[PDB]
């Protein structure tokens, strides 16, 4: 029987119209022990709002048990800990598992937006580039859009520990180069806690 | 518990350097290429750790024409087996273009210069910087990212002082690759 802790989305923490949940996964539930039983706690004080969903029995013949938790965000935007305790009469111990933010002090994102060189005009596609760098925690959000509406087009790198102990990441977002030099402008948000409104956004087109 | 491990790119696409397969788990290791065994191994011993267990590694040097065309490395321990290859496919080409630093990013001191390769496969890769022809120690590569037509994409970035970049030195980004004519190309960059 092993436990899996899962943190909330960065977006859903970031804006107060969404709900970020804690989740507290439990595989491997044999058929002879099959009852589990969540407590939960925040910073070691135990909380009784969760929601257990009924266990679902997996084609390798073991049950997998699920219990949610809903987080204030800021409580997690200031690192209030998640401590998921699994019990089941298998187990010699109950399992705990405690999940938080990372530690420190929040830094804010340089969103440098960056267009295609010289060699790329080659081919008929064009990456536009959207560099995002000293910021810390890892936890971020990027998307790109046009005139309005999201592109779909892109893909985003994983968040890279720099030498000043901040993160950096790149968002590149593919076109037409037809798209480019009707001089469309092409624009990068960025969501994370140490923007304002938990937001930005930089903008990008040929001149 | 074993955990077999690929060579180091550099190590499989220049001559000089030497490639090895590392095998991490009384152990015994035998090794194969290709189901055909081989001798050539060595059990380096031995490293008890910080939880009162052991960590036994064993590590095989490999051709690098052997590796490059894809043959499989088994690593047989003895108390489990293990196998490891190169990513089948056809290398393709990486695509290196050098970006310099944005019109906002001059307010501060220093600077990103970026270095985005893309279009390469296998994902197995390396990315140094250098200027005048010597070493450069302040940048950062990110891990090589799969895109829609299955070939992989990184960016590699530089900072340095803006005294440099106003001052014209030219910065280059060196990256190698099996695909690349003599497993090498370079890109440099400056103001202007
Ligand atoms: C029997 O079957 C079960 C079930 O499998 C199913 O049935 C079988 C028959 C097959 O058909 C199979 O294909 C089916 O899927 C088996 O159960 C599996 O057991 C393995 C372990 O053996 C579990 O593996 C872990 O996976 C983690 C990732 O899990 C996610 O990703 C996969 C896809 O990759 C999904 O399938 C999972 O469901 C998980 O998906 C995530 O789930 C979250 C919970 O809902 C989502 O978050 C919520 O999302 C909602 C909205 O959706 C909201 O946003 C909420 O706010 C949010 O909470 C989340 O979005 C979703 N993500 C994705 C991408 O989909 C791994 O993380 C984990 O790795 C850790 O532990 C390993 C040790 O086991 C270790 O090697 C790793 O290195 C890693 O260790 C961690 O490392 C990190 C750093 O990277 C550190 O930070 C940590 O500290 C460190 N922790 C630890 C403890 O070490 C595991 O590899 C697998 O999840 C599980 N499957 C399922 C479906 O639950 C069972 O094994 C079978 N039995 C046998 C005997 O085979
Ligand atoms: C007691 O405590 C010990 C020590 O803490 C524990 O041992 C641990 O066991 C874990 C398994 O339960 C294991 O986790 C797996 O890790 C592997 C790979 O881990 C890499 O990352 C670590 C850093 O994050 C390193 O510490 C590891 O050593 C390993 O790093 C790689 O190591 C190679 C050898 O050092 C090296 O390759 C060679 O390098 C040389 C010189 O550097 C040459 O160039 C040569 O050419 C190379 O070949 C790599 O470069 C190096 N890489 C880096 C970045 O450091 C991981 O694959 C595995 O993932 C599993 O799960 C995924 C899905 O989740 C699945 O797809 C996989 O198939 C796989 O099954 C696990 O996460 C720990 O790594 C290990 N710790 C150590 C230090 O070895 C145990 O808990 C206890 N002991 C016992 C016996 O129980």
């Not at 859903?12 to 099959?34: F, K």
């Not at 909380?47 to 013949?61: G, I, L």
């Not at 760098?133 to 998307?143: H, N, Q, R, W």
Request: net charge neutral.
């Amino acid at each position: 029987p092993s436990v899996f802790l899962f943190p909330p989305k960065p977006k859903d923490t970031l804006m107060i119209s969404r709900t970020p949940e804690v989740t507290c996964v439990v595989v491997d539930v044999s058929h002879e022990d099959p009852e589990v039983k969540f407590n939960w706690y925040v910073d070691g004080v135990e909380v009784h709002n969760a929601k257990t969903k009924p266990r679902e029995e997996q084609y390798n013949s073991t049950y997998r048990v699920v219990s949610v938790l809903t987080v204030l965000h800021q409580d997690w935007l200031n690192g209030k800990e998640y401590k998921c305790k699994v019990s089941n009469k298998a187990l010699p111990a109950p399992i705990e598992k405690t999940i938080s933010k990372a530690k420190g002090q929040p830094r804010e994102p340089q969103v440098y937006t960056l267009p295609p060189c010289r060699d790329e005009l080659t081919k008929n596609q064009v990456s536009l580039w959207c560099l995002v760098k000293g910021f810390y925690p890892s936890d971020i959000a990027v998307e790109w859009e046009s005139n309005g509406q999201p592109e779909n087009n892109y893909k985003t790198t994983p968040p890279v520990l720099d030498s000043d102990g901040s993160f950096f990441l790149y968002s590149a977002l593919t076109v037409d180069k037809s798209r480019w030099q009707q001089g469309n402008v092409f624009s990068c948000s960025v969501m994370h806690e140490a923007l304002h409104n938990h937001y930005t956004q930089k903008s990008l087109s040929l001149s």
